[PDB]
């Protein structure tokens, strides 16, 4: 066929019930994730090819960058609670990988302050039980698929995108292939 298991995607041995429709995992320490966000705009090109009624979920993971990796997963929970993902994603990526000015929880916090989120508002979110459960959800979703690498995308709890098996001569072509694959899995 044109789309085949083990080619553009793989199938989970252990499917996950009740999972978000489109589930994306990343790390601010993850170099292809940086590309995925800054250069390829994957999430966004996928989103536009998704139909009506499809929600898109993105989660951070702990297994990169040790102690700071976990701080980053909590900070992403803050970003999700306050609805400011689109204001911190880029400075967080560049702070970790480009300028390397993010070295502590305080530095993460600085990124949010510079983006216009208020100190009081950030620290209250940071310490809130709503953020604790949001951290819990991020870990639970990754655990459910026994996640070992990022970037990773899963569709309806049962398919996992396999970008290795797509052409990378052309960056634009890679992205369309990726999003068209998400759409195909979507309709399955």
**What distance in Å separates the CA atoms of residue 73 and residue 66, rounded to the nearest whole number?**
11
**What distance in Å separates the CA atoms of residue 134 and residue 143, rounded to the nearest whole number?**
14
Sketch out the chain's domains with CATH numbers.
1-188 (3.40.30.10)
**What distance in Å separates the CA atoms of residue 151 and residue 39, rounded to the nearest whole number?**
14
Specify whether the CB–CB gap between 15 and 145 falls below 8 A. Answer: no
Nearest-CA neighbor of 59 among 46, 67, 69? 69
For 24, phi and psi rounded to 5 degrees?
A: -115, 130
Please name the residue ranges forming H helices in the chain: 31-34, 42-49, 66-82, 85-93, 105-114, 119-127, 129-144, 171-187
- CA torsion sign for 104, 144, 54, 150 is positive
Edge-first strand listing for the sheet containing 56-60: 9-11, 159-161, 152-155, 22-26, 56-60
**What distance in Å separates the CA atoms of residue 180 and residue 50, rounded to the nearest whole number?**
9
Nearest-CA neighbor of 174 among 17, 23, 40? 40
Specify whether the CB–CB gap between 13 and 154 falls below 8 A. Answer: no
Interacting residues of 179 by C-beta distance below 8 A, sequence separation 6+: 42, 45, 46, 48, 49
Is the preceding peptide bond at 151 cis, omega within 30 degrees of 0? yes
Nearest-CA neighbor of 153 among 7, 9, 5? 9
Nearest-CA neighbor of 109 among 120, 122, 96, 127? 122
Q: How many CA atoms lie within 13 A of 183 on its CB side?
A: 16
């Amino acid at each position: 066929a044109q789309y085949e298991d083990g080619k553009q995607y793989t199938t989970l041995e252990k499917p996950v019930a009740g999972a978000p429709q489109v589930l994306e995992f990343f790390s601010f320490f993850c170099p292809h994730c940086y590309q995925f966000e800054e250069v390829l705009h994957i999430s966004d090109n996928v989103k536009k090819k998704l139909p009506e009624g499809v929600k898109m979920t993105k989660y951070h993971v702990n297994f990169m960058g040790g102690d700071l990796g976990k701080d980053l997963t909590q900070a992403w929970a803050v970003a999700m609670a306050l609805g400011v993902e689109d204001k911190v994603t880029v400075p967080l990526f560049e702070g970790v990988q480009k300028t390397q000015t993010i070295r502590s929880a305080s530095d993460i916090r600085d990124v949010f302050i510079n983006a216009g989120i208020k100190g009081e508002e950030y620290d209250a979110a940071w310490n809130s039980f709503v953020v604790k459960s949001l951290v819990a959800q991020q870990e639970k979703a990754a655990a459910d698929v026994q996640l070992r690498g990022v970037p990773a995308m899963f569709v309806n709890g049962k398919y996992q995108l396999n970008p290795q098996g797509m052409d990378t001569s052309n960056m634009d072509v890679f992205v369309q292939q990726y999003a068209d694959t998400v759409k195909y899995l979507s309709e399955k």
